[PDB]
UniProtKB/Swiss-Prot annotation:
HAMAP family: PEPCK_GTP (MF_00452). It is found in: Cytoplasm, Cytosol; Endoplasmic reticulum. Binds 1 Mn(2+) ion per subunit. Its cofactor is Mn(2+). This is Phosphoenolpyruvate carboxykinase, cytosolic [GTP]. InterPro entries: PEP_carboxykin_GTP_CS, PEP_carboxykinase_C, PEP_carboxykinase_GTP, PEP_carboxykinase_GTP_C, PEP_carboxykinase_GTP_N, PEP_carboxykinase_N. GO terms for molecular function: carboxylic acid binding; GDP binding; GTP binding; magnesium ion binding; manganese ion binding; nucleoside diphosphate kinase activity; phosphoenolpyruvate carboxykinase (GTP) activity; phosphoenolpyruvate carboxykinase activity. Mn(2+) binds at K246, H266, D313. GO terms for biological process: cellular hyperosmotic response; cellular hyperosmotic salinity response; cellular hypotonic response; cellular hypotonic salinity response; cellular response to cAMP; cellular response to dexamethasone stimulus; cellular response to fructose stimulus; cellular response to glucagon stimulus.
């Protein structure tokens, strides 16, 4: 980029650049970098190249600074422990900026929307001015050029993230394609502008907790889709700071998708091969902390079945000229929930995470390894544990050894069952789409939608127990339509209309739509379904249905498996009565709840087809 004019020496940041060159940046990239440097006043500017040496040195630097620790039991793995105020997404501080509120969320009848948070442009400007001026004083501003999707993909989009956090830098290296090749690929093209600061300019005004720079009181994660900007202040935690992931690849991207005729979704993408040598790709939207990563890299218990992972969290999809729904994973790594992860529940993850992996808020064993709730693996006598709170911890204490939302951040290329087409620019053809969440009562193991319009309603109607992915506590059953409640880039009613419109386009090969429940419990609080690898039995049913197998019976909520259609061999004890039961009383209550929620929260933007599906379901239940 060209040197900016100036009458003094305060606008050209060249003298502060410690890696790279402002002169060699594309013009608009330099303007973005330099304009935000003038604002944030970093001491240095480091333009990331994405090299292993850059990565190695930056890790070493955080190490000597006490910001991360080396996990010496493994190969190039590292541990960060955060300030306990900065441990997850915060939905209440996550906002979208548009001229009119209705462009961002439907106007709720009750007056409080549960489908996003809108902030006026003028309110945002004030919030921005109270945060960012001088916020990087005494820090390095890192410039991360990154690509969502393989360098080529028709589906791929480039961002530049500016951050004062080396932790963000290292994590983005794993979770996106990052560095010099991205700038070369961008040229003078368009990019998403992403600005991040931990909100702790030097000298420190507040006491630093556990060497983790953050500003909880001022935390704000903002999205400005008209400006193509994401602006995030005060949090270093993944979902808030790795701007390509939730901020770009769901929130911004879903709005772009609506405008441009594609889809951006909170979905895994997996490839499943049967004993007859046939492979199908499926997508699944479950809410945060509801099993996507476990399903995407499942080790099937059924002989002759194979599952391969394309992506575990984000799907970008578009109908091609042939009418196939084609999906790509825009991420480059897995940012997975650690606790619960074991050789038993997710052996494929256990394999992936022992090299080149960054862990956040898990426990450390005295021999340099990791520990967490449900790791289900004994330690040798004499091995001791440091909790994620950096305290000595014993298996019989008050609190967990790892944070409930503790994460691993691991390269996708490492996964032993990574799908061979996971970086194909063409994407993979999706043949079914699975919705589901945590319902301890009433909702059977699996059912199939009656039609496209009904499947879109099933997505819209999704409810699920609260999890630790964000700020929500306890186990209350919440609405989480399409697993996208925290992530809609625009009015949910319009998003429903967008999904419905897919049925109207030329030669569209619409996928089969299913709904699952891994989480139904008996009257004792015991899970009725073993889950995990055993979920291959459900996927088998879905596979045959996609092929047109006569294996379904009609019920009021959709098609279910016929008696004996599911392979339950090796699971002789399963209470099929309760697991597959559909109660009129439960479903009457359920449909009334859905009706009130859609009326209140979607209101004037609720598409007629969805209100029709509600009426029809209500009618079918009334005839039980
Ligand atoms: N009982 C049971 N638990 C499961 C199952 N699948 C996943 N889990 C657990 O649910 C928690 C979260 O699962 P993940 O697969 O990481 O969820 P995710 O959808 O990828 O979550 P986000 O990354 O937050 O979007 C972990 O503790 C898992 O061990 C299952 O089939 N049965
Ligand atoms: O990080 C995630 O994947 C989430 O919170 O859903
Ligand atoms: Mn997620
Ligand atoms: Mn996940
Ligand atoms: Na720390």
């Amino acid at each position: 980029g060209s040197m900016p004019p100036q009458l003094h020496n305060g606008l050209d940041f060249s003298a502060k650049v410690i890696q790279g060159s402002l002169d060699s940046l594309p013009q608009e990239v330099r303007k973005f970098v330099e304009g935000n440097a003038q604002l944030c006043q970093p001491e240095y500017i480091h333009i990331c190249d994405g090299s292993e040496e850059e990565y190695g040195r930056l890790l070493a630097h955080m190490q000597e600074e006490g910001v991360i620790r080396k996990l010496k039991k493994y190969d190039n793995c590292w541990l960060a422990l955060t300030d306990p105020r900065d441990v997850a997404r915060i939905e209440s501080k996550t906002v979208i900026i548009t001229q009119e509120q209705r462009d961002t969320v439907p106007i709720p009848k009750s007056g409080q929307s549960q489908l996003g948070r809108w902030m006026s442009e003028e309110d945002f400007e004030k919030a921005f001015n109270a945060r960012f001026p001088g916020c990087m004083k005494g820090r390095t501003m890192y410039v991360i050029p990154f690509s969502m999707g393989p360098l080529g993909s028709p589906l791929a989009k480039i961002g530049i993230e500016l951050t004062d956090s080396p932790y963000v830098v290292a994590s983005m290296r794993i979770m996106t394609r990052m560095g010099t090749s991205v700038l070369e690929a961008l040229g003078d093209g368009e990019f998403i502008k992403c600005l991040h600061s931990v909100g702790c300019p030097l000298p420190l005004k507040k006491p630093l907790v556990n060497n983790w720079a953050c500003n909880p009181e001022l935390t704000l994660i903002a999205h400005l889709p008209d400006r193509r900007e994401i602006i995030s202040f005060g949090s270093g935690y993944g979902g808030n700071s790795l701007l390509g992931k939730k901020c770009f690849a769901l929130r911004i991207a879903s709005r772009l998708a609506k405008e441009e005729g594609w889809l951006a979704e909170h979905m895994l993408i997996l490839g499943i091969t049967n004993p007859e040598g046939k492979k199908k790709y499926l997508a699944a939207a479950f809410p945060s902390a509801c099993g996507k990563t476990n399903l995407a890299m499942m080790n099937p218990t059924l002989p002759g079945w194979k599952v391969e992972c394309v992506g575990d969290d984000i799907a970008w999809m578009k109908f091609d000229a042939q009418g196939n729904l084609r999906a790509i994973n825009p991420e480059n790594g897995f940012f997975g929930v650690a606790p619960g992860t074991s050789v038993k529940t997710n052996p494929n993850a256990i394999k992936t995470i022992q090299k080149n992996t960054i862990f956040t808020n898990v426990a450390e064993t005295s021999d340099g390894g990791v520990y967490w709730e449900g790791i289900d693996e004994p330690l040798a006598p004499g091995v001791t544990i440091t909790s994620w709170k950096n305290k000595e911890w014993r298996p019989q204490d008050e609190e967990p050894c790892a944070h409930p939302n503790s994460r691993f951040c691991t390269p996708a290329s490492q996964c032993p069952i990574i799908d061979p087409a996971w970086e194909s620019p063409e994407g993979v053809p999706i043949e079914g789409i699975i919705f589901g969440g945590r319902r301890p009562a009433g909702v059977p193991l699996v059912y199939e939608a009656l039609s496209w319009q009904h499947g879109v309603f099933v997505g819209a109607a999704m409810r699920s127990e609260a999890t630790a992915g964000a700020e929500h506590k306890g186990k209350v059953i919440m609405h989480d339509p399409f697993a996208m409640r925290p992530f809609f880039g625009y009015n949910f009613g319009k998003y429903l209309a967008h999904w419905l419109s897919m049925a109207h386009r030329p030669a569209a090969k619409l996928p089969k739509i299913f709904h699952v429940n891994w989480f139904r419990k008996d009257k004792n609080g015991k899970f009725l379904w073993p889950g995990f690898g055993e979920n291959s039995r459900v996927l088998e049913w879905m596979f045959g249905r996609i092929e047109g197998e006569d294996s379904a019976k009609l019920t009021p909520i959709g098609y279910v498996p016929k008696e004996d259609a599911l392979n339950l061999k090796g699971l002789g004890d399963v209470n099929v009565e309760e697991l597959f039961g559909i109660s009129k009383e439960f479903w009457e209550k359920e449909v009334e709840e859905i009706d009130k929620y859609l009326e209140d929260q979607v209101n004037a933007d609720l598409p007629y087809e969805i209100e029709r599906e509600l009426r029809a379901l209500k009618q079918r239940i009334s005839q039980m």
